[PDB]
């Protein structure tokens, strides 16, 4: 879902259901939805080890 430009499946409430069922609380997946031009970003980890 960081990636962009794949055809979404047809029912929106079905597609917007997966994207929420995955990106939610993912260590990686986006914070703000895709900018139509640039790239999505990765949440900043409070600290690394």
């Amino acid at each position: 879902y960081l990636g962009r430009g794949a055809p979404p499946l047809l029912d929106n409430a079905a597609a917007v259901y997966l994207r929420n069922a995955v990106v939610a609380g993912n260590r990686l997946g986006p914070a703000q939805p895709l900018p139509v031009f640039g790239c999505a970003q990765v949440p900043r980890r409070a600290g690394m080890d």
């Binding site: 962009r4 430009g5 900018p35 139509v36 031009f37 640039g38």
Partner: protein
């Protein structure tokens, strides 16, 4: 070094008038006020130390302002193009899918520019960078009146620029610019002038382009002491006089101008860049733009947009019309001579 042409040879030293001030001030007198009433090298490097000493005793030459900017080489190339070409700087591109959504007239595609830019980062892969002028002609080559040299600028860029399928950028970056006309964010709101080439440093994917943001052209420290000389080269699709088209053959300083033209039709939109040499002031310029570019005004409520570029301070300005070889393709190239760069701001004409 003490020649015997000493009528003008002393005046080439900058003189004897340096003592004009130095005599009654420094040579005389006690005033401020008095009272009333080991075989070859060294001397090889040793004269190099003396060359520092010959440069240290004293500190005509007009001033410059050189600028350098580290530039990714996707859309532009300082490599294929020699010293003495125009360059154009940009802004950041993720503002393009934002400003097109609110500046469009009602009844157009605001999601057109948002997709057209991502197809250029996905075509130049097969960030306020730079676009060179010669690259921009081949993109807008399909809108000109002299189309033969427009097909000659495109004839070398696909073969000489660093990258694979530069013609796929040329067909996509022009598709970006044809989307700029539709989505009403005009390309003069993006393109910023960057000075003429003097030198450039190459690396993987980025280049350190040096240019003159202000000043004369012909005497810059080009870097090569064998050739510290460069002239300004423009392809002949863009160079439009207004001395011949207005029958002004009277001598005087000519002004250089960058001009955009716009054409808004339903999915048939065009882009053209022109460099305009005129003897007209900027206050008396738009009346000439009304005369030549009224066909695009009737069919469209702006029609053109221009900015200042520089001044040829000659009493008779000097042009050339040659065919230079950039790589292996001869392009009809207009060469301007004795050009002094001074930029300026843009203009709207609704």
């Amino acid at each position: 070094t003490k020649p015997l042409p000493t009528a003008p040879m002393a005046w080439a030293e900058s003189s004897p008038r340096e003592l004009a001030g130095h005599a009654p001030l420094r040579r005389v007198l006690r005033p401020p006020i008095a009272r009333r009433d080991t075989r070859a090298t060294r001397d090889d490097t040793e004269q190099a130390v003396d060359k520092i000493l010959r440069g240290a005793r004293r500190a005509g030459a007009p001033r410059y302002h050189l600028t350098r900017q580290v530039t990714l080489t996707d859309l532009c190339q300082p490599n294929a193009e020699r010293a003495g070409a125009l360059l154009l700087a940009l802004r950041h591109p993720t503002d393009l899918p934002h400003l097109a959504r609110h500046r469009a007239p009602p009844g157009r595609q605001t999601e057109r520019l948002a997709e057209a830019w991502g197809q250029l980062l996905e075509a130049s892969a097969l960030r306020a960078g730079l676009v060179s002028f010669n690259f921009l002609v081949a993109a807008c080559a399909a809108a000109y009146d002299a189309r033969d040299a427009a097909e000659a600028v495109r004839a070398h860029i696909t073969t000489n620029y660093g990258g694979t399928r530069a013609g796929a950028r040329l067909d996509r970056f022009s598709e970006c610019l044809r989307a700029m006309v539709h989505t009403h964010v005009f390309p003069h709101e993006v393109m910023r002038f960057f000075g003429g080439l003097v030198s450039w440093v190459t690396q993987d994917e980025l280049a350190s382009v040096t240019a003159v943001c202000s000043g004369p052209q012909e005497a810059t420290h080009t870097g090569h002491p064998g050739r510290p000389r460069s002239a300004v080269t423009i392809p002949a699709c863009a160079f439009v006089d207004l001395d011949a088209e207005l029958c002004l053959g009277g001598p005087g300083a000519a002004f250089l101008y960058l001009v955009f033209t716009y054409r808004q039709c339903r999915d048939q939109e065009l882009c053209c860049v022109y460099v305009v040499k005129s003897q007209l002031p900027p206050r008396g310029l738009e009346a000439a733009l009304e005369r030549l570019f009224g066909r695009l005004r009737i069919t469209n409520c702006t029609y053109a947009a221009f900015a200042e570029l520089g001044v040829m301070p000659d009493d008779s300005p000097r042009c050339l019309h040659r065919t230079e070889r950039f790589g292996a393709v001869g392009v009809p190239v207009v060469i301007l001579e004795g050009v002094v760069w001074r930029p300026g701001g843009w203009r709207a004409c609704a």
